[PDB]
Structure 1
Amino acid sequence: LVHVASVEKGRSYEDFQKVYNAIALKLREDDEYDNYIGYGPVLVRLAWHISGTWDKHDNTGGSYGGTYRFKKEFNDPSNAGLQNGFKFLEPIHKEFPWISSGDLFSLGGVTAVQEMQGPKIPWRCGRVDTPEDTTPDNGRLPDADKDAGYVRTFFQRLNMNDREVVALMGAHALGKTHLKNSGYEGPGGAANNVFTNEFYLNLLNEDWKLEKNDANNEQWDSKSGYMMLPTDYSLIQDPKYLSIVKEYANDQDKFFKDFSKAFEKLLEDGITFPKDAPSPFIFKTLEEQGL
């Protein structure tokens, strides 16, 4: 399967910076969502789940085709709760009907991270919508109730290595688990709509307790009111993972730099970019624009 990036006709940096600003302006406006967390965390989760279907072996799945717009992927049990990120973006797609679905879902994730004061993420245009029959089947996204060997093995399919996996998981400092979506409940920290390295700090400094929640699932709970998933706590159980966790709890700039590279790579897996294709765009935030 080859998927070649095709820039939307005649579009350039300024067009996509207009779509960025539209998403970012609505993130500021619709602030009440999920008890004032706002839409940013569900939008970086949506960009991860449309990319996380990729399989390196046959180049199926991935962010290129925008296939989450089809019922099979929209109704995947693993995507429960992401309909709220879709409905947030649907106004903006009506306003810029020329951007492809893959591009709009991935730029929403980029915009949310930078607007929640994360690192800049280089983003590239050119994903092309593909037919309903290209939609990957349910079951390619990871279970939460498993251990470190499962996480390592699952992420080899998206060929991410240990460092990349640990840098990507730092995004679980954002938002929260919702019992009616996943059977898990609670936030992982106090700053859950500002991008920081707090996931790593909480993992190493809190007093975790294995408890059973109302959906009868086990999760790691702390006195402070935070929770960690079994696959999250996995990172301090494995010796290779645990020493990268310590590296990111001791250096927030290295965390930001490595997250930026692994999230771009995540979003680009499966796509062939021609050598005459434009460079990756670095978008300015509303704040850097005085907007």
Structure 2
Amino acid sequence: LVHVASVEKGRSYEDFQKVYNAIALKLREDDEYDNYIGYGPVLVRLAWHISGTWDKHDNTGGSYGGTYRFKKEFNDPSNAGLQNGFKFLEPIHKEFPWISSGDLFSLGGVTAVQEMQGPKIPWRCGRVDTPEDTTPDNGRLPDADKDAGYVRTFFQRLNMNDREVVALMGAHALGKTHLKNSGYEGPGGAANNVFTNEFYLNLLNEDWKLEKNDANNEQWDSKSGYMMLPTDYSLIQDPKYLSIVKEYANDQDKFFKDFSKAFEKLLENGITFPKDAPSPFIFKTLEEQGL
């Protein structure tokens, strides 16, 4: 398939900035969510999940068609817990009905990161809603109980290399696991709602113990009360991964630059942007607009 981006008819930057502003203001306002974590984390996860079903082999899946909106994808077990991100976005959509779904879902991840103090992520509009039959089957999202080879192999399907994988994993600093959703439980550090290189620092600095949890799954638990999934821990088991983890742990800026590029790439996978398409936008945060 070819999925050409097509700008929402007659909309420009300022139109997008408004959807952004709306998501942002609601993030501010719904700060009680998940014990005061806020909805940031879950939106980031949502944008990753709708993008992660992509398959470089046949160009199927990916963010383009907003298929997450269909039952099949919505009900994907790997998507448990995402319905909250959805519900949060719904009223926004209602307010700006001309925005396509893939555009909205993805724009929320961007807003989330930036509002949580992360780096600015350039973003492009143009995703087009596609039919229910374009919905990818379940099983395209990664499992958490594996190792580094698994992770490397998986991400290759999305054209991400080693540096991209590690950068993107740095998002694991945010939110937490929820028993009922994934069978894992616990936060991965202390500033779980601010975007920093904490993830890397925790992986290198804590004294991790392997143990089973109440869902009878294994996780790496630290004394401070943090946890790491196997796939997370595997970043220190692989030598190639580990040197990159070290770099980010030592330089937040580098990490921010690499994340930013990787995230965009991840959200733009499988989409063709015509030469005449507008450049990527860089949205101002609420704070830069004095709002």
The TM-score normalised by the length of structure 1 is 1.00
Report Cα offsets for 1:149-174 as digits up to 9, x if no partner: 00000000000000000000000000
TM-aligned CA deviation for residue 145 of structure 1: 0.1
TM-aligned CA deviation for residue 144 of structure 1: 0.1
Matches within 5 A, 1:101-116: 101-116=101-116
TM-aligned CA deviation for residue 109 of structure 1: 0.2
Distance 2:248 2:222 in 1: 21
TM-aligned CA deviation for residue 198 of structure 1: 0.3
Question: 3-state DSSP class of the match of 1:270?
Answer: coil
Distance 1:12 1:290 in 2: 21
Question: 3-state DSSP class of the match of 2:221?
Answer: strand
Percent of residue pairs bearing the same amino acid type = 100
TM-aligned CA deviation for residue 114 of structure 1: 0.1
Question: 3-state DSSP class of the match of 2:247?
Answer: helix
Distance 1:40 1:249 in 2: 22
Number of aligned residues:
291
Distance 2:92 2:57 in 1: 34
Distance 1:279 1:156 in 2: 27
The TM-score normalised by the length of structure 2 is 1.00
Report Cα offsets for 1:190-231 as digits up to 9, x if no partner: 000000000000000000000100000000000000000000
Distance 1:142 1:9 in 2: 36
Report Cα offsets for 1:92-151 as digits up to 9, x if no partner: 000000000000000000000000000000000000000000000000000000000000
Distance 1:177 1:290 in 2: 34
Question: 3-state DSSP class of the match of 1:220?
Answer: strand
TM-aligned CA deviation for residue 188 of structure 1: 0.2
Question: 3-state DSSP class of the match of 1:267?
Answer: helix
Distance 1:155 1:278 in 2: 29
TM-aligned CA deviation for residue 253 of structure 1: 0.2
Distance 2:5 2:208 in 1: 45
Question: 3-state DSSP class of the match of 1:68?
Answer: helix
Distance 2:277 2:234 in 1: 40
Report Cα offsets for 1:52-108 as digits up to 9, x if no partner: 000001000000000000000000000000000000000000000000000000000
Quick check: 1:235 aligned with 2:210? Answer: no
- What stretches of structure 1 move > 6 A for 4+ residues in a row? none
TM-aligned CA deviation for residue 176 of structure 1: 0.1
2:95 matched residue in structure 1 = 95
2:69 matched residue in structure 1 = 69
Distance 1:283 1:246 in 2: 30
2:202 matched residue in structure 1 = 202
CA RMSD of aligned residues (A): 0.2
1:283 matched residue in structure 2 = 283
Report Cα offsets for 1:218-277 as digits up to 9, x if no partner: 000000000000000000000000000000000000000000000000000000000010
Question: 3-state DSSP class of the match of 1:210?
Answer: strand
Question: 3-state DSSP class of the match of 2:176?
Answer: coil
Distance 2:277 2:162 in 1: 31
Distance 1:230 1:66 in 2: 30
TM-aligned CA deviation for residue 24 of structure 1: 0.1
Distance 2:260 2:242 in 1: 20
Distance 1:55 1:77 in 2: 19
Matches within 5 A, 1:135-150: 135-150=135-150
Question: 3-state DSSP class of the match of 1:211?
Answer: strand
Question: 3-state DSSP class of the match of 2:187?
Answer: coil
Mark the runs of 5 or more structure 2 residues left unpaired by the alignment. none
2:187 matched residue in structure 1 = 187
Distance 1:61 1:275 in 2: 23
Distance 1:271 1:61 in 2: 10
Question: 3-state DSSP class of the match of 1:201?
Answer: helix
Distance 2:217 2:286 in 1: 41
